[PDB]
Structure 1
Amino acid sequence: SNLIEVFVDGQSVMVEPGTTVLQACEKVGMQIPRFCYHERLSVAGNCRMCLVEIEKAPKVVAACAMPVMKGWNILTNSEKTKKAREGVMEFLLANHPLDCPICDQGGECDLQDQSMMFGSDRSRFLEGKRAVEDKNIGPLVKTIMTRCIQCTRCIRFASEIAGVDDLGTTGRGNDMQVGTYIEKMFMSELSGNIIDICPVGALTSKPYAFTARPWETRKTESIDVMDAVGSNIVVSTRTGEVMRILPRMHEDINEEWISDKTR
C-alpha cells in the first residue's frame, strides 16, 4: 500500500519509498556495478561506477544514492549506461599500477572483475602514472597505497563501524591520499575488516601476504571459537593447510565482520 511501482528494464517492481535505484535493480536479480557503495556503510556516491540511465532522462543517475521515483524505468543495460561504465572504469585504471601478478588481490579483485565485465579491453592512456607513498598502520594491515582508488570505504568503516576517526583523506584532486596524515597505527579489535571491504589490493593482510591465490583455496564454512559470539567464518585451506580466516555473512550474529583475534 505504501509501495510505489518502478520498472527495471521494463519489468515492474513494488518498492518501499526511499529505496535507491540500486536496490530496485537487486529486487529483479540485477547487481549494479559498484566500488564505493557498501550496504553496511553510509552512502558515498564518489566512485561513479553505479551510474545508470533513467528512461527519458538525459543525465545518468548514481544508482547507489538516487532514490527511485514512481514510474521510473531503469535501463541497466542501455548504450548510455554501458558507455558510462566504460568511461568510469577507464578513469579508474588510468593511474592504477600494473601490479596484478604481485598483488594479493589478484584473482579475487573487484577492479579486475568489473573491468572484465563492464570496462573496455584496452588502454588509450599514454602518460605516466601517479605513485603514492605507503603508510604504516600496524602489524596486521599492509598498505600499498598506489593501488587505492579513493573509494573511502575504509574511512567510513573506521568511523561508523569501529568508531575510530583515525582514517581520512589529505590533499586534493589527483593528489588526494587516504591515510592517517601522522604516523599512527590503526589498532582496533575490528581493524582487520578493512582488508575485506577494500575493493583493491591497497589494504591487504600482512600475515597472508604472498602465500596463496584465491582460486586454489578450498572454503570450509565453520564457526569461530575465540569468543562466545559464535561468528560465522570460512576457513580457507590449500593442500591440507589452513591459509586464512574470512568472515561468513550471518545477519543475526556477526553480519559480515569478525574480530582481529578470530581473523
Structure 2
Amino acid sequence: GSDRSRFLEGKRAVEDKNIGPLVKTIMTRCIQCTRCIRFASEIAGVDDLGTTGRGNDMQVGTYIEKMFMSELSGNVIDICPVGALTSKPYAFTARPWETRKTESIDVMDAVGSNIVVSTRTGEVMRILPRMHEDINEEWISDKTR
C-alpha cells in the first residue's frame, strides 16, 4: 500500500452494537468483508448476522438487539482481521509484541484442541487457537478462551 492519504473529506461513524459479554463491537472500523456472517452461518449454524442497507451506510450486524451467544463465538475475534470486534476480557490489557507464546493444549473437553497460551511478565493474558486439521480446525470453544 501507499504511505499517504489524498483524502480530504469527513469520515463516517457507525453505531455500535452490544452483542454480549465477550465480543466487543466497535463498528466504526469494520471493512465490510463478511468473513463473520459466513462463519456464523456455515460453522456455528446461527444465521443471526448480516448486512443492513447499502453504500457506505451498510452496517454489519443484526438489525436488532440480539446476544450472539454461541459455543463458537469467540472465533470471530480471530476471524475479523480488523479490530472491529475484539474480546472484552483481553480488553486493553496487553499488546502482541509484549507477549510470549507457549504451545499447549486444552483440558476442558476431551477433544485435545491445540492452543497457544499468551503470557506477559509471568501472567496469562489470553488464549488462542493453534492450527491442527485433525482437531481444532483453527477453531476453539468459548470456554477454553
The TM-score bracket by the shorter chain reads: over 0.9
Following TM superposition, by how much is the alpha carbon of 1:233 offset from its aligned partner in structure 2, in angstroms?
Answer: 0.3
Which one has a larger percent helix, Structure 1 or Structure 2? 1
Deviations 1:38-77 (A, max 9, x none): xxxxxxxxxxxxxxxxxxxxxxxxxxxxxxxxxxxxxxxx
Instruction: Work out the CA distance in 1 between the residues paired with 2:108 and 2:52.
Output: 37
Task: State whether structure 2 residue 56 is matched by structure 1 residue 157.
Answer: no
Structure 1 position 255, deviation (Å): 0.9
Partner Cα separation in structure 1 for residue 112 and residue 14 of structure 2: 39
C-alpha distance after superposition, 1:64-101 (max 9, x if no partner): xxxxxxxxxxxxxxxxxxxxxxxxxxxxxxxxxxxxxx
How big is the shift at 1:262?
0.8
Q: CA deviation at 1:241?
A: 0.2
Cα distance between partner residues in 1 of 2:72 and 2:56: 30
What are the superposed Cα offsets for residues 91-144 of structure 1, whole Å, 9 maximum, x if unpaired?
xxxxxxxxxxxxxxxxxxxxxxxxxxxx10010000000100000111000000
Cα distance, 1:224 vs structure 2: 0.4
**What's the secondary structure of 2:81's corresponding residue?**
coil
d(CA) in 1 for partners of 2:32, 2:45: 20
Residue in 2 aligned with 1:228? 110
Q: Distance in 2 between matches of 1:183 and 1:232?
A: 34
Structure 1 residue matching 2:86: 3-state secondary structure:
strand
Match of 2:23 in 1: 141
Cross-structure match for 1:192? 74
In structure 2, distance between residues paired with 1:147 and 1:226: 34
**Residue of structure 2 equivalent to 1:173:** 55
**Structure 1 position 207, deviation (Å):** 0.5
Q: CA deviation at 1:155?
A: 0.5
Q: CA deviation at 1:214?
A: 0.3
Return structure 1 stretches of 4+ with deviation > 6 angstroms.
none
SS at match of 2:118: strand
Q: 2: distance between equivalents of 1:261 and 1:153?
A: 22
Structure 1 residue matching 2:28: 3-state secondary structure: helix
Q: Sequence identity, in percent? A: 99
May I ask how many residue pairs the two structures share in their alignment? 145
Aligned to 2:84: 202
The CA deviation at 1:186 is: 0.4
Cα distance in 2 for residues equivalent to 1:139 and 1:128? 32
User: TM-score when scaled to structure 2?
Assistant: 0.99
Q: Secondary structure at the match of 1:196?
A: helix
1:180 Cα shift? 0.8
Q: Residues 129-168 of structure 1, C-alpha deviation per residue, up to 9 Å, x if partnerless?
A: 0100000111000000001000000100000000000000
> Aligned residue for 1:31?
none
**Pairwise CA distance, 1:229:** 0.2
Q: Which of these two proteins has the greater Rg computed from alpha carbons?
A: 1
Q: Secondary structure at the match of 1:219?
A: strand
TM-score, normalised to structure 1, is 0.55
